[PDB]
Amino acid sequence: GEIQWMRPSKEVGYPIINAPSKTKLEPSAFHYVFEGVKEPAVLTKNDPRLKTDFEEAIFSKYVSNKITEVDEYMKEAVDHYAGQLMSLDINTEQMCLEDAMYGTDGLEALDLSTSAGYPYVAMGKKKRDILNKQTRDTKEMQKLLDTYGINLPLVTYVKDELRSKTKVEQGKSRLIEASSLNDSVAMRMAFGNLYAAFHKNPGVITGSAVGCDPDLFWSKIPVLMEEKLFAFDYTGYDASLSPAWFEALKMVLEKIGFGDRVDYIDYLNHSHHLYKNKTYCVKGGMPSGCSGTSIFNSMINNLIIRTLLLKTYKGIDLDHLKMIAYGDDVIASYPHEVDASLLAQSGKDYGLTMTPADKSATFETVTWENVTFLKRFFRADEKYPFLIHPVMPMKEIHESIRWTKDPRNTQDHVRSLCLLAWHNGEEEYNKFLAKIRSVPIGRALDLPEYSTLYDRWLDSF
């Protein structure tokens, strides 16, 4: 990820974008009943809590490109992984516009709330104006695809989410590059079946966990894993991807019968953006708000791990590599132990910043007792050990519950948190409910009791 040039949108014939100046996050009914050190992210240059410059901070995520081309290791990584994906026998056909828009088995319908992108965000035209979940009309879109084509700029928003005290004072706010509806729709027709295959097959064959149900999936993971687990964290993964990874991705796509439309990847790779009154071209780096971002990040992560293993451990048997990635987050295993610290060093060769798994000071052995995936620990059930609980630390939940974007969505936001919470144990869950019910709002909510959640869970297998 590296900016090639940047300048006023007017110079290249583009208008200005009105990204909202105020956060939607405000203290919830539970703000003072729970403990949390997070605050809404910095959105504009004006925020009094800023210590260092704002503009610089947000864009500093674009490092540079350490590699240009695809080497021998990467090529073999491509072969191996492409080889696995073929066993799924994925439908290489294109997906009709209807499904691409309003869903189908394996793919949810377009998110009616998220940004519509250029040129719509500049005409004041929203998504609710182009779609009907009941009419399932496509004449609207169809006309718009003919009118503004594809390959449109990515409108760039500052993400409205909670952040640590440090990251707020250093303006370390994350960016959302939202693709135009046209691009999103197009890509969905182009790769819909691929996405669906992935969602319907979370595991070690896809090497993906996208679209999984952790309550159920956790019990499968251990079985799918080889004897020795290894993991690490990435720093600014999306932005650190060099154009070469995208090439390898195209190679994979091409090998699985999608060669036909690998150009779409070029669009993600060598991207064109709009932010406020500026416009910039970016070389490398996966844009965050695009159709397929997760899946593609996950696919690349598969290639990354393989590449590093080939480089670092010549002779390795990739067929005995069991990994599951969700974007940059990953859980992997091998019959023999591996040294993540080595892999991290080889990582830098490919422009990758790999650090000890879960902010650990130094690389330590990964065990079922200390490993996390999607922020969750794995804890065998006390009564039925063959069933595994996805355990989200309470800290995370406490943080989340203290804020709110919409007072009407409180019922669901709390309800959601419970589905996460109860895995921490009955004593823990009850304390949580106790705290919730200490305030008028939380008392008027409709939440499930521990035993209820636990039974529904057992019944679910």
CATH number of 375-461: 1.20.960.20
What span, in angstroms and rounded, lies between the C-alpha atoms of 346 and 306? 12
Q: Report the half-sphere exposure of 13 (CA within 13 A, side-chain side).
A: 1
Annotated binding-site members for Mg(2+): 233, 328
Token digits of residue 238: 């999306």
What span, in angstroms and rounded, lies between the C-alpha atoms of 24 and 29? 15
Annotated binding-site members: 233, 328
CA 314 to chain centroid, in Å, comes to 31
Token digits of residue 437: 């019910």
Name the DSSP letter for residue 60. Answer: T
Closest by CA position to 184, among listed 99, 267, 110, 291? 291
Closest by CA position to 168, among listed 68, 25, 269? 25
What span, in angstroms and rounded, lies between the C-alpha atoms of 247 and 269? 9
Tell me how crowded residue 104 is: count the other CB atoms within 10 A of its CB.
16
Coil/strand/helix, residue 425: coil
Closest by CA position to 282, among listed 264, 269, 296, 266? 269
Domain 213-242+292-367 coded CATH 3.30.70.270: yes
Q: Given the DSSP bridges, would you call strands 271-275 and 154-158 parallel, antiparallel or unpaired?
A: parallel
What span, in angstroms and rounded, lies between the C-alpha atoms of 122 and 120? 5
What span, in angstroms and rounded, lies between the C-alpha atoms of 247 and 228? 31
Q: What stretch(es) of the chain map to CATH 1.20.960.20? A: 375-461
Q: What stretch(es) of the chain map to CATH 3.30.70.270? A: 213-242+292-367
What span, in angstroms and rounded, lies between the C-alpha atoms of 375 and 358? 9
Token digits of residue 459: 């019944």
Residue 133, CA distances (Å) to 66, 94, 175, 179, 291 in order = 45, 21, 30, 21, 19
Residue 279 CB partners (closer than 8 Å, separation 6+): 6, 7, 8, 9, 11, 12, 14, 153, 272, 273
Name the DSSP letter for residue 116. Answer: -
Residue 411, CA distances (Å) to 28, 423, 436, 444 in order = 12, 20, 12, 9
Start-to-end C-alpha separation, the chain: 43
Question: Any bridge partners for residue 158, and if so which?
Answer: 175
Positive or negative torsion for Cα 53, 56, 58, 60: negative
Resolution (A): 3.0
Coil/strand/helix, residue 64: coil
Name the DSSP letter for residue 93. Answer: S
With beta carbons less than 8 A apart as the criterion, state whether 416 and 436 touch.
no
Which amino acid, 307?
Answer: T
Name the DSSP letter for residue 254. Answer: I
Closest by CA position to 330, among listed 198, 237, 191, 241? 237
Coil/strand/helix, residue 433: helix
Max CA distance (Å), the chain:
67
Token digits of residue 22: 């105020």
